[PDB]
Design a protein around this ligand. Structure first.
Ligand code: CYZ
Ligand code: CYZ
Ligand code: CYZ
Ligand code: CYZ
Ligand code: Y4Y
Ligand code: Y4Y
Ligand code: Y4Y
Ligand code: Y4Y
Lengths: 256, 256, 256, 256
């Protein structure tokens, strides 16, 4: 029985190769998660077939219908056997499915054009604007935060004219690059570093992470792959394979 | 039934109260892990009794008898029901006990007397010597590595007179303090920050983490507390409780 | 019996004389290898007839027919009795023919348009591009190299836009000439010095050799000419004749 | 039938271990040639016993008795099976024994205290004196050199007061370190680099090599180990093991 691996199209995790039209099968894709899936299969000795999620969403439960969609929905309704992709380990997902130990740590970071070196410095001043998405984990973190620094950051953002929120990460990066140093973007650190290593190389990551999260390999609740997959993730972390894969797809392939 | 919690005496995770001679029970202890245990017990609704591990070790399997010691030994052999301590999540430990999601992210960092802002800056020069614990996870990581930067650092460390390795982390920090800027110490980032926030505040942490590890809450294999404890950690992480506890015992109670 | 010598037309080893139409026999050719053949024949006391290999190839085994071409194919299949040419001593060739002690030492060197003093200086910066041939020993050496410096050069070469690889060495030197100090070429040290000593004298050899190879006199396996030719090569090396011939065709006849 | 591997006590090729008195067998020694012998044994799958030559000589034929001594003598009279040591491939030795392809290329270089960057610069001036061994291969090379520059250097050395010749390499190095930049030493490039990478690190190698030589593994005339040993040497050269071994015992263990 071939293991159905559900993934998502996100760079540099899973992306189509340049000559993907000629190729077929698992050779159509490449990226960090493709190598991770290959290593996981090698450790556990199974045959897998990569599949891009049709919905194109990471996974959430609709309020009115209580129906999961995306990768989490595919795992819940038995449409896939494993999800090797940057899926964030959250409470509701852990309630509905199984997560392995995180294979990549991340957090909320600050993006500026290549004056600010910390979140506290951003909160103190008012010349430089900053914002997040109109909805998502980062905005929810800022809205609910009880720490004084993040509380005043959220108070400024909620009371900023014009609105500092952006509809998509691409819009935020574009505003950062077009604001000539008068706007800052708050986003995941992994995406921050990835964009930092892209042309035209005009953005940079400043300061530490405002919080801590992780990407975990997801397995259906009650499946037999959970323990071997978790052990494989720990083994890959301990031999440093995950460090090498991160360096390859972020800095070795960087264009800066 | 009262849940027995095994723990180790390590500042600031668990510290003995100043007036503990006249105190009894769980009121004798304080620290980050004590507050974490209180939060976990409140979430899961059980009564617990904090106990300190007899041998004062985190846990390892001897190559001679295949016998676990420390908190891992207490967990596998039925002595304790749960371990709430800075216990690193490792493959050999995960094969014998259940680890929850990490509640603290850490890594290998550089400690110097308070330029050099990265490990490659240390590697390039040789005027400033750097060292590692005599026998531990960090020394194992430096010896067993694939990146030639860390391989070069390890090669310099083994072929160096006098030996840069130190018996204990206390001896390493003492050497850093007495070396007036000539010697650097490599250790866990959490302990690095804790020492940085301690008197006489002559040390500082530079650069980022070389690797990525985590501290997890451990339960015996097949225990009924594994699932509720894992969900509690995720709940406390997303509400900022773990962030608040980290600041309270690292910065709010600092002496610098 | 006249000894058939197989050679390859390559400056300055074997070059065709200016008035070669009016000449016939061995008087048609001149170069370092012609003088070496004269010395070897004088030492071993035999008459020889210089011939140019038909396909103009040094020698390689076909991956599909296991058939040797070039001068190695000439020697193996009984066509020629000895090869006196810049034939690199390799493991695959030594299994099928006999190599004398090397008469020329060489290696991989850096050619730039005339700062950088070595290979690590090239590897560190990215302002100046560098690339090897599309195939050959240099590409394989950079591929298999486990050294950090050479591995990072190989990483830069494989992932580079536009492609730094070159179809032919003539196009490589042309690209170096036209690049006005922006592109560097990696090739054999002997050819590097030879091109340096030719007009318009706009190139220079910098740094030192990266690897170590050698050119040897080749003889069919199990032949009576092996040991006398090896002894002749050693005697000429210890008498300075090989040094004298190297200077004559590289510097005494240079155009710079 | 174990293989007797004769060798010489020369650094960094073969030297006694720091705690060699406690140890016994092949673990008693260490060095570049020890690792080379280990790799050669691994390639050919034989068991070997390292022995230091009693005479402490590399090998030469007496003028009167015409009896070889040293390592060459041990090989000739059947007292050893292979010589894995820095033995120079010369004409008389190749007439008497078998040599493999060189595993290390060396030459004559200039040693100065840390004004001169080549041999012609040394020949042009007269402020800095230069000398070689009172009796050795370098003095013989200079005595019968037909090149003009080496001829005038030999003329200067022959008619020089006080005499510039030395009785031992250590004496030459000491004279270089004592004459405060007013004396130059001509010696093998490998030894030059070795001394350059040792305390107190006051000498350096300048310019290129004046000639070309090589170190070869020696095998008795007519033995069956010659071809496999030669193939092993070529294989080690092509994979880069010889480069790695040289870098380890010269630069990775250097004290400068
Ligand atoms: N992608 S990375 O180099 O930053 C990275 C990140 C992480 C790694 C390993 C690597 Cl290489 N392992 C840890 C795991 C190891 C054990 C401790 C925490 C989890 C269980 N998770 S992590 O902190 O998310
Ligand atoms: N700021 S910190 O070091 O105290 C810290 C570190 C970490 C936290 C929470 C905090 Cl507060 N939670 C994460 C967990 C949450 C979910 C995503 C990764 C694991 C599962 N692990 S972590 O990245 O090791
Ligand atoms: N100066 S050069 O490149 O023309 C050159 C190069 C070399 C020469 C002689 C000369 Cl003149 N002889 C040596 C040979 C001599 C003895 C020692 C190594 C081989 C056997 N090979 S070499 O190191 O490849
Ligand atoms: N860099 S080094 O001195 O350790 C070194 C020197 C030499 C090496 C390999 C190395 Cl790593 N191989 C060559 C050999 C390979 C083939 C060509 C010449 C001989 C046969 N001899 S060498 O030119 O004497
Ligand atoms: N791979 C980055 C990334 C990862 C995500 N993982 C999730 O589980 C999620 O719900 N949303 C995400 C958004 C992004 N994003 O577009 O920045
Ligand atoms: N930082 C607390 C700490 C926690 C540890 N947990 C472990 O599982 C371990 O094997 N070694 C540790 C060392 C330390 N230490 O003293 O730095
Ligand atoms: N004469 C130099 C030279 C010699 C070579 N000998 C070979 O056996 C070979 O396979 N390729 C070569 C390429 C070159 N070259 O053009 O750099
Ligand atoms: N450098 C090693 C070294 C190797 C040598 N090999 C020889 O075959 C030799 O006749 N004399 C040598 C002298 C030395 N030396 O002491 O410099």
């Amino acid at each position: 029985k071939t293991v159905v691996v559900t993934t998502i199209l996100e760079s540099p995790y899973v992306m189509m190769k340049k000559n993907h039209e000629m190729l077929e099968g698992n050779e159509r894709y490449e990226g960090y998660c493709v190598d991770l899936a290959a290593e996981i299969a090698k450790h556990c000795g199974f045959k897998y077939k990569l599949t891009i999620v049709g919905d194109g969403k990471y996974g959430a439960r609709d309020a009115d219908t209580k129906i999961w969609n995306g990768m989490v929905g595919e795992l819940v309704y038995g449409k896939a056997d494993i999800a090797i992709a940057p899926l964030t380990i959250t409470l509701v997902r852990e309630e509905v499915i199984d997560f392995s130990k995180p294979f990549m740590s991340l957090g909320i970071s600050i993006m500026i054009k290549k004056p600010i070196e910390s979140a506290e410095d951003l909160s103190k001043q008012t010349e430089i604007a900053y914002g997040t998405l109109d909805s998502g984990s980062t905005k929810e973190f800022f809205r609910r935060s009880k720490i004084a620094v993040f509380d005043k950051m959220w108070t400024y953002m909620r009371s900023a004219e014009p609105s500092v929120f952006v509809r998509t990460t691409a819009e935020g990066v574009a505003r950062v690059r077009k604001s000539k140093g008068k706007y800052a973007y708050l986003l995941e650190s992994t995406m921050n570093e990835y964009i930092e290593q892209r042309k035209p190389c005009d953005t940079m990551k400043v300061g530490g992470n405002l919080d801590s999260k992780g990407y975990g390999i997801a397995t259906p609740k009650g499946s037999s792959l959970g323990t071997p997959v978790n052990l494989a993730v720990l083994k890959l972390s301990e031999q440093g394979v995950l460090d090498k894969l991160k360096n390859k797809w972020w800095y070795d392939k960087g264009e800066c």
